[PDB]
């Protein structure tokens with residue numbers, strides 16, 4: 243799901259970045275680290291709304307090294323998967339255990355055992371495709387996958403989907 | 414019965430019977446909670462109720478106060494066909510003869526459905542349901 | 552005759568099959584019950600009973 247949440251991050255700056263323009267640098271860092279990365283607590287961070295009204299609060303000096311620590315509160319658009327969530331995706335890589343569906347920035351995997359019996363694996367084709375009794379699952383094909391479980395590891399999120407139930411499969 | 418309510422859980426009276434016993438309308442078979450939940454949770458497959466082969470679907474269950482499968486099927490089909498026929502040419506003017514004749518036709522259709530005959534007249538009754546639905550849409 | 556007298560018609564205690572088997576001469580009713588699978592016996596010995604008054608409370612919570 244594509245949600246919007248106010249996140250807070252502690253930014254560390256080197257003593258060489260204490261110019262009057264340092265605020266800009268903050269925002270710069272606040273982009274370079276937050277946009278594109280991922281967190282196991284809020285999901286894949288997509289974008290960061292409100293770039294002009296970014297609160298800076300007050301910077302504190304930690305003991306050694308002399309680097310500066312900041313607490314920034316902002317608003318960001320993030321993407322977080324959920325268990326048992328119907329999503330759509332396109333296949334990228336194919337495997338004998340199942341094809342790897344691509345849903346946004348997340349690469350969900352579908353186990354072969356979590357597939358109907360009529361859906362069979364075909365390696366003789368290029369690329370290897372899953373041929374069923376009516377639908378042919380190829381790379382560029384669009385498949386509606388129902389996510390059964392999700393894993394929220396730090397800076398790394400992988401989920402498992404299935405298409406065995408009704409109203410699923412290729413789009 | 415107190416001796417058959419699930420092929421795996423047929424005697425749960427001394428195990429504190431706190432689980433219900435659902436029945437699928439496409440099987441008419443009693444299955445306890447912990448079993449059917451795994452059944453439709455692992456995929457729409459058939460229940461092993463005395464070697465049953467009819468597929469049990471996900472959800473679409475019902476609570477049963479037990480009035481025999483014959484009367485339960487006759488009241489389910491009775492209500493469904495009663496909703497398909499609706500009130501077409503019933504209280505349109507106040508006639509009693511043609512109204513009772515049409516009710517006799519509807520009840521004869523429900524009778525042919527609960528008896529099945531030879532799987533030939535019931536299909537014509539299904540086409541009659543599609544025709545009546547087409548008349549209700551217009 | 553002891554082997555032919557099935558189910559507590561003639562009981563004994565098989566000790567060793569090399570010393571004429573020191574026997575035993577008592578009677579009850581069934582005594583066989585070898586239809587009880589060995590797996591059920593292994594699952595019966597692995598159950599650790601809650602001592603003291605914990606067992607009646609654990610049985611009154613289940614409804615027995």
Ligand SMILES: [Zn+2]
Nearest residue numbers: 419422445448
């Ligand atoms: Zn059961």
Ligand SMILES: [Zn+2]
Nearest residue numbers: 440442460465
């Ligand atoms: Zn059944």
